[PDB]
Amino acid sequence: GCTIVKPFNLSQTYVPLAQQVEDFHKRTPNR
Amino acid sequence: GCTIVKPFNLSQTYVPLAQQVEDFHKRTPNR
Amino acid sequence: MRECISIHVGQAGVQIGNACWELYCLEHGIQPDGQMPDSFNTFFSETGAGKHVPRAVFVDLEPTVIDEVRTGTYRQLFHPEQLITGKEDAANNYARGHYTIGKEIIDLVLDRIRKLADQCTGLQGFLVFHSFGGGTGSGFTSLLMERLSVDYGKKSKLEFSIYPAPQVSTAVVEPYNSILTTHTTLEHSDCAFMVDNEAIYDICRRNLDIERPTYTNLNRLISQIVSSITASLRFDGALNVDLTEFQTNLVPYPRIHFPLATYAPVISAEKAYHEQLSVAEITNACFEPANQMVKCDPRHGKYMACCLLYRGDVVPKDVNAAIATIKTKRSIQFVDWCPTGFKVGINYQPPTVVPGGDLAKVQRAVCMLSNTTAIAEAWARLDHKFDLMYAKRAFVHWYVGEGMEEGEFSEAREDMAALEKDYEEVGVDS
Amino acid sequence: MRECISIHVGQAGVQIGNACWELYCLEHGIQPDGQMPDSFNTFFSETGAGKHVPRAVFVDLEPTVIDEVRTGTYRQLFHPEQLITGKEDAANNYARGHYTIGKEIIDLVLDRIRKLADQCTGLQGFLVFHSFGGGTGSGFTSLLMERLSVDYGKKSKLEFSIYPAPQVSTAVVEPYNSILTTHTTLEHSDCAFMVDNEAIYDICRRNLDIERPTYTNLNRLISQIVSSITASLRFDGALNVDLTEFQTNLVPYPRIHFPLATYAPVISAEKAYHEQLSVAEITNACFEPANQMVKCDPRHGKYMACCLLYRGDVVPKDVNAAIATIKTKRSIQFVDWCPTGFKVGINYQPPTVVPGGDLAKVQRAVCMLSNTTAIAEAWARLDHKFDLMYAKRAFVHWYVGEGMEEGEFSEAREDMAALEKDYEEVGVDS
Amino acid sequence: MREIVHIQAGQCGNQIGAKFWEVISDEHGIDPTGSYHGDSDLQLERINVYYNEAAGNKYVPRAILVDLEPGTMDSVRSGPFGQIFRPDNFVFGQSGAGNNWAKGHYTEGAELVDSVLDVVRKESESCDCLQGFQLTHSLGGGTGSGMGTLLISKIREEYPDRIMNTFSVVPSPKVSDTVVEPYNATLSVHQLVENTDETYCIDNEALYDICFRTLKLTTPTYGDLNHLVSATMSGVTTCLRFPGQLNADLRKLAVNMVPFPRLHFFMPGFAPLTSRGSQQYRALTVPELTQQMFDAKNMMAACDPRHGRYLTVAAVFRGRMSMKEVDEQMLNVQNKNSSYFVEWIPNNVKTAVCDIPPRGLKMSATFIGNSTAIQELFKRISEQFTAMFRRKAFLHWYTGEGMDEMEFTEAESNMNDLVSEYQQYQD
Amino acid sequence: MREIVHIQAGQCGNQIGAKFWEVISDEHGIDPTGSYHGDSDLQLERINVYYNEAAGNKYVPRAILVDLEPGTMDSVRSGPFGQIFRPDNFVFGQSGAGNNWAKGHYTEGAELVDSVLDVVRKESESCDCLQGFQLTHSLGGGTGSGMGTLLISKIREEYPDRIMNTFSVVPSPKVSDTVVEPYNATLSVHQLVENTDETYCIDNEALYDICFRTLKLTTPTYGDLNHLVSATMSGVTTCLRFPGQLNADLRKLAVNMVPFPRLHFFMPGFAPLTSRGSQQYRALTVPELTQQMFDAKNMMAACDPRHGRYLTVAAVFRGRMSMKEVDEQMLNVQNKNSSYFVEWIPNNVKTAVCDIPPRGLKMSATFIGNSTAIQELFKRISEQFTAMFRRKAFLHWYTGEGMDEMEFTEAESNMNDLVSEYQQYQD
Numbered sequence A, B: 001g002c003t004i005v006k007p008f009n010l011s012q013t014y015v016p017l018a019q020q021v022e023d024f025h026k027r028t029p030n031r
Numbered sequence C, D: 001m002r003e004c005i006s007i008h009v010g011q012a013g014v015q016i017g018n019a020c021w022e023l024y025c026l027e028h029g030i031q032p033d034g035q036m037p038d039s040f041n042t043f044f045s046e047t048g049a050g051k052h053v054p055r056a057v058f059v060d061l062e063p064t065v066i067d068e069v070r071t072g073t074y075r076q077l078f079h080p081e082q083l084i085t086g087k088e089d090a091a092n093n094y095a096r097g098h099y100t101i102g103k104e105i106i107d108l109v110l111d112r113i114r115k116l117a118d119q120c121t122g123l124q125g126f127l128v129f130h131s132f133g134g135g136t137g138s139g140f141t142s143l144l145m146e147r148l149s150v151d152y153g154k155k156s157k158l159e160f161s162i163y164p165a166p167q168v169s170t171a172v173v174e175p176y177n178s179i180l181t182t183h184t185t186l187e188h189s190d191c192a193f194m195v196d197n198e199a200i201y202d203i204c205r206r207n208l209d210i211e212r213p214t215y216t217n218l219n220r221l222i223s224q225i226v227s228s229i230t231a232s233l234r235f236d237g238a239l240n241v242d243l244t245e246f247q248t249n250l251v252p253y254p255r256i257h258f259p260l261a262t263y264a265p266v267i268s269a270e271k272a273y274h275e276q277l278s279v280a281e282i283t284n285a286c287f288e289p290a291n292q293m294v295k296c297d298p299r300h301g302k303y304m305a306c307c308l309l310y311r312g313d314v315v316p317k318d319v320n321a322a323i324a325t326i327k328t329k330r331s332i333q334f335v336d337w338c339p340t341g342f343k344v345g346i347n348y349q350p351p352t353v354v355p356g357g358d359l360a361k362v363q364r365a366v367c368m369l370s371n372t373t374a375i376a377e378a379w380a381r382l383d384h385k386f387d388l389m390y391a392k393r394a395f396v397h398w399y400v401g402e403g404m405e406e407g408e409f410s411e412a413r414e415d416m417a418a419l420e421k422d423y424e425e426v427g428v429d430s
Numbered sequence E, F: 001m002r003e004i005v006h007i008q009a010g011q012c013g014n015q016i017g018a019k020f021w022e023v024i025s026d027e028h029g030i031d032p033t034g035s036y037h038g039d040s041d042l043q044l045e046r047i048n049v050y051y052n053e054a055a056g057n058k059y060v061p062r063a064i065l066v067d068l069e070p071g072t073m074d075s076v077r078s079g080p081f082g083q084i085f086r087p088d089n090f091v092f093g094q095s096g097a098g099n100n101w102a103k104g105h106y107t108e109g110a111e112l113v114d115s116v117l118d119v120v121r122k123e124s125e126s127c128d129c130l131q132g133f134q135l136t137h138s139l140g141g142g143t144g145s146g147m148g149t150l151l152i153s154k155i156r157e158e159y160p161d162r163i164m165n166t167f168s169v170v171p172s173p174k175v176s177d178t179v180v181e182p183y184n185a186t187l188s189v190h191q192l193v194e195n196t197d198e199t200y201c202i203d204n205e206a207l208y209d210i211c212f213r214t215l216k217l218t219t220p221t222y223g224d225l226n227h228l229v230s231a232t233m234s235g236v237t238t239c240l241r242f243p244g245q246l247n248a249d250l251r252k253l254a255v256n257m258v259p260f261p262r263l264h265f266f267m268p269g270f271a272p273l274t275s276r277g278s279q280q281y282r283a284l285t286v287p288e289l290t291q292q293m294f295d296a297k298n299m300m301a302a303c304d305p306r307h308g309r310y311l312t313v314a315a316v317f318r319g320r321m322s323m324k325e326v327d328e329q330m331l332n333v334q335n336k337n338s339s340y341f342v343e344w345i346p347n348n349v350k351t352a353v354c355d356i357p358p359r360g361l362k363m364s365a366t367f368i369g370n371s372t373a374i375q376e377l378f379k380r381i382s383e384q385f386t387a388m389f390r391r392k393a394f395l396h397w398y399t400g401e402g403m404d405e406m407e408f409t410e411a412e413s414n415m416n417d418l419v420s421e422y423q424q425y426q427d
């Protein structure tokens, strides 16, 4: 009918400056 | 009427890779 | 965009890196002075007019290896500030690398990295080259990786490591360093390609007909693997694999990120003429134990995922055929929880060959990256080696002297035990 | 497709093989460097552009004979990896061949064979060349044959063997080796063509007018027979015989797979001009004891089946006539359980002749492969020879030293006794 | 007057899309610059179905090109016909989706999609009477599958009364190029079930078989495969683009072929198909075309029609043909092959005829079959999904994009239900 | 309108088949390209009996070429007329059968045969009213014999109401080229007895005799032999292909020649036959043709008709001839040779006349005799089989292909029964 999962037991921000600059221009405003 | 047999008493898988490849193409499916 | 930043740590890292940069230059037509008489931008920044600079940082705690680079053929390729050198090495001591000596240089290197990264507009991530056995390659790299993980966070980090051999070991304390670095490698690395010098030597002797292969021979081969990995970013073909893509395909569970790399065909100029090196053939050769970059037996392990990265005169159909053939080979077993374990990349550019290199020029090549349980055997032998020495506390005092605590060793060993156990578990069928 | 793989084992096997490969090259117009300025594919793989490589593996436990090939005229014809050589020979000791020395090289040769076979898409089977008397030719071949039988199973194996002479024997221990190899030959070989050096020598002196025939003379002749067998695959004519076909026709019972080969006409340039070598004549000459490749008397035996393989300017009608004539000759008797004992092949290509060879160029030739009870006489003499030496246990200690057991000898002798008895039985009329 | 809006999502979608556009421009006499250089007035009569008319005797595809990677866009623009497309209709990300349906559907794709929506709204406004949408993509990757599905949902929300058509290339296990395909397909199939009105199941495996076996093509490329798909696509909308004797558009086809809402997954076929050598030994006639079309070897989905029953078939004929002949041949096929047709839908075959044949041929045929055998395709996929999902293999990546296990469970259930439904009507 | 479907199996079958096709194309004015370049409207009137009409004024043989070896196919394709055949009608294996009936009937042939069946079904569909099948082969090998027989069985199962004709070249002991011939012949003969409606017994020995003795041909080739066979084949179906004064097709011939179901093994003959030197010293007349035809030396089976009795003879005449003359000559032969004709079938001779003579001749004749002397042929074969089977010689090979001894016993019994039956009616 449906799948049943039994999982085995295992052992358990910056942005670039150039990119930022680019975003300043090519980011579309909400408008 | 019919033959009768009396037999004298005597002392008593791999496939090539290229071939396989070929089969993969030129084998016709069941369809 | 799509830049990758390369970090070369310690002697081994530096020397591999040299080879890599030689290869990249040849591939993009960049001369040793940075001039080029586009895709090269993935590896190079471009400045002003007729100048290209590698997106790379070279670090060692001693000056000797880097000093060669400064004096040598590619002195104009790198700007001086990207070649970072201390005064005293880590002396095969993880503690010195991570703490005593490393704490003096780490900030500086991080700053430079940040500067480099600011120049790149589509950072894919980092390629980190280092040995597991050396004090710098272990201790410093571990430290560096932590810091990078903190600062950058979700950026992909890929580390290429010269893992120590079973027999052919050059230093005594190697198992200690290896164990200690592994602990940190687990949490801060997204994918780790282990490589074994002994295996490379065997390959050079058997496949390339070289009586006496030296480190220069190994490094060249190693660079080729890296090129195959990054060719999908530096060129374009019929089927493409990005780094994130690769990670998605090749890594089934977070900790199980240790694929084995293998390259095909590795042949001599004269030996190659006679051979009819077809797609099927090279693919088949990938899954053979003799061509492996780590000493271990795949026949005794199970495959979880393989990425096949083809380059040159290759079409999808024949790759598919090869994959089908591989499927029908009983001696190559895949785990039952992976009904298809093949990610496939195909790139149009044939492998370019370094003038004076050991490898012959071929129309097609392949780099297979496969996650097999068999690699756990290496860890087992290393662990065993560690356990003997630790039984007597041999050399331990040195580490303690440089600020390391005994409890750390035990912790590290435990971590590796747990990892081996995890690897065992994934193996078993239901 | 329709490939045949040739395996050349030990000195004798190597030397016959050299001749064979010289002949094949000449037949297909392949130069000694692999270049050819189609059917040749049955014997050659083709690589890239202007290169053809023999579908062959050359094996010896000592380097000397193969080393000649490496240095010599056809060094470029074979790729180095197809020429396999150990360090120490089997020293006329079956045990050393099969066990002590052979176990070191067998795996490697098998691997290479597998690689070779993977390249072929319509494998017909194997041609195995070796002596019965040498330690490598016996012990190694026996081992190899077993392994091949295991791996490949239902593939046809054809072995061409230099069986030891009654008088002209070069080594002392020959009968031991011969007996031991025969045991294994029985179970793992589908068809075996025995050949006797003494007979060849007689032929060379009597038919070719050669005062002093050497091994090079024998080998050339031997190669011709092989060519006749495989011409049906390498060319096409009016009537064709495949290997399976041949087996079906020539082999009445599983163990009775020992046909005698004979070739006609074998003549000198000057002697041939005068003779009017018709189809009928050559056919008649086939069934004469003086032109046999094994020393023995067919007049004292009975024919069970003969394959006649004609080549060159030949038409069916005259072959039929010849067969009819043969039927009416009282001195050539066929068993009563075979009302027609003739399989006939006719191929359009005349035999090509090696420059500087002993044989004259003819418009037509024939190779007869006939299963006659008369060959049992050879076995009888060999058995007798064996029995004397074994009576004193002469040389036995050597074999034991290399891991052989005395019981094996007895077993082998018994097997041969049983075989001789079987051969006797088939002979008798009802 | 009945404009169709075309959308291409992800690499496969883009590439097939490009092929489609190339063929269609040729058909309508449009060159690589957008200028009409055809012969017949029929080529321009209904040009507005696929093209917007720009200033100075030029035509521009009503096409939107979408991808999370710009490489694909570059490849398209650099192609033969690349310059015909509106520059503002290329909507691309920079990152890619890494074969992750979640990235395409919830994350990167989510960020991207509003631009696409804006474009398509404008494209809708431009058209006087938009009959609906055609989306080309694959179900096995991340962009085409996740982003594509998302886009479909958005579109349907805004245009609930318009016809929603997809040409979906499904992952097969023979030609299995990726690891997570089962997941991506499963997730996307579910979404398709609720939001598309007709879905053409295109299979790479079947295409390869066609190329190798029927076309005798030693080395097929993706381009060659794509060509087949393009032909099929062209076939469906021939009735919208040209005159004819009996005409059926996208709606008429759907109404005749879909008896229950969910059962809208077609196995397409195209006829004729011949090798270059075997072209001279054939008959250019309707019985031959018919023969070709109903054959299992000419279906573009890897399913044996003899393993199920046909609910409906729609056949679209192009060229000058006798209606009587067509009617006889279609009745013959249903009478002779009675056992492969469901018995509770009399006259299982719908016919449409367009007088204008494709270039190079005097007659051609396009076949759309709704067969219960399509369940085979879904079943395999389901099995593969199960194999992975049972061990939660690769799930962590998807969960990192905000997905929960429960969604997987739902999708799987849904697909199973669909399969069951098909079986029910098969009987 | 009365299409015949031609099948060629194994080397001999193929080669004779090729010859047959060559002659027939010449007869019907078809060149090596498939184009009609004849003079008379009669040449095209019934062209559909043997040829399918392709696009652009071309004709293609309704011929299927079958072999377990591709070499034969290659040889055919490379021959003069090789290019006329449909490429899709070549159905070939790669291995060969190695003169083993079991490989042809149960193993390799089994694997092969479904393709062949598919082809022939299509070929049947193409024809408006297929009257039946003609198979050319030999009984002594593996393919033609084992595979051929298998194919026949399959065909008859699907077309039980169609006429099933074979041109079977039998192994003779004089011209004995193989060892296991007796086995292969025995096994195949049995199968033929139950599943063919008429079988033309062609013997290589007889052909050689004809060539040497009658045609004065110093060096006959298989080609020359084949020519004779081809002529005979052409003769039988002349009434289907042309007009005439009295017409008999394949069915009419069978009904008149076969009084009991099993007795359908013909000894064929063809007249006239002359040397090049001896051609000028002869009379082109019906009495001469008649004289030639009934002679033992002109029969294509190595049997003396004077060692048995004729059950029936069918004579097929081609050319402009007097019916009266034909009737007188046929009555004369039966009155004069009373003792060689069974007395309980009055007027043992059936006559058919076609107005169109073959090329090069003004008149020709084809003779089909059902003689009880054919038992001689079977008896020899039986004897040879016994000689081998008594010692179980070469049986192991056959058993390796799945065959049992019991089958051999059965076949032998069956053949013996057939022989007995012929003897019975001989009296």
Ligand SMILES: Nc1nc2c(ncn2[C@@H]2O[C@H](COP(=O)(O)CP(=O)(O)OP(=O)(O)O)[C@@H](O)[C@H]2O)c(=O)[nH]1
Residues within 6 Å of the ligand: E009, E010, E011, E012, E013, E015, E016, E068, E096, E097, E098, E099, E100, E138, E140, E141, E142, E143, E144, E145, E169, E171, E175, E177, E204, E207, E222, E223, E225, E226
């Ligand atoms: N028939 C065709 N199949 C294709 C083509 N290109 C790719 N594919 C197939 O589709 C699958 C790969 O899909 P894609 O490259 O489209 C995945 P997409 O780019 O849409 O999203 P990403 O996950 O962001 O890459 C796989 O089965 C390929 O073998 C094509 O041009 N034709």
Ligand SMILES: Nc1nc2c(ncn2[C@@H]2O[C@H](COP(=O)(O)CP(=O)(O)OP(=O)(O)O)[C@@H](O)[C@H]2O)c(=O)[nH]1
Residues within 6 Å of the ligand: F009, F010, F011, F012, F013, F015, F016, F068, F096, F097, F098, F099, F100, F138, F140, F141, F142, F143, F144, F145, F169, F171, F177, F204, F207, F222, F223, F225, F226
């Ligand atoms: N009258 C003719 N007889 C032939 C011809 N070719 C072969 N033969 C005869 O037929 C017998 C050999 O038969 P085949 O080559 O046809 C056996 P086939 O290829 O059908 O099966 P295999 O056993 O797989 O070879 C033998 O008596 C030949 O002498 C031919 O062109 N004409």
Ligand SMILES: Nc1nc2c(ncn2[C@@H]2O[C@H](COP(=O)(O)OP(=O)(O)OP(=O)(O)O)[C@@H](O)[C@H]2O)c(=O)[nH]1
Residues within 6 Å of the ligand: C009, C010, C011, C012, C013, C015, C016, C061, C089, C090, C091, C092, C093, C130, C131, C132, C133, C134, C135, C136, C137, C138, C162, C163, C164, C170, C171, C197, C215, C216, C218, C219
């Ligand atoms: N493949 C390869 N391995 C190398 C090379 N140089 C050193 N190694 C290996 O690296 C390990 C030694 O570590 P190094 O990198 O020399 O040491 P380090 O990182 O400089 O650390 P310290 O000198 O202790 O500060 C050993 O396993 C060496 O075999 C090289 O050029 N190529």
Ligand SMILES: Nc1nc2c(ncn2[C@@H]2O[C@H](COP(=O)(O)OP(=O)(O)OP(=O)(O)O)[C@@H](O)[C@H]2O)c(=O)[nH]1
Residues within 6 Å of the ligand: D009, D010, D011, D012, D013, D015, D016, D061, D089, D090, D091, D092, D093, D131, D132, D133, D134, D135, D136, D137, D138, D162, D163, D164, D170, D171, D197, D215, D216, D218, D219
């Ligand atoms: N016809 C022929 N016979 C040969 C040739 N060389 C050796 N012999 C015969 O082969 C037998 C000796 O066996 P070899 O092949 O020399 O020995 P081997 O196989 O190398 O075995 P070991 O040297 O004992 O390892 C003798 O009967 C020789 O007469 C040759 O070139 N032609």
Ligand SMILES: [Mg+2]
Residues within 6 Å of the ligand: C010, C011, C062, C089, C134, C136
């Ligand atoms: Mg150092």
Ligand SMILES: [Mg+2]
Residues within 6 Å of the ligand: D010, D011, D062, D089, D134, D136
């Ligand atoms: Mg030796």
Ligand SMILES: [Mg+2]
Residues within 6 Å of the ligand: E010, E011, E069, E096, E143
């Ligand atoms: Mg993509």
Ligand SMILES: [Mg+2]
Residues within 6 Å of the ligand: F010, F011, F069, F096, F143
């Ligand atoms: Mg044959």
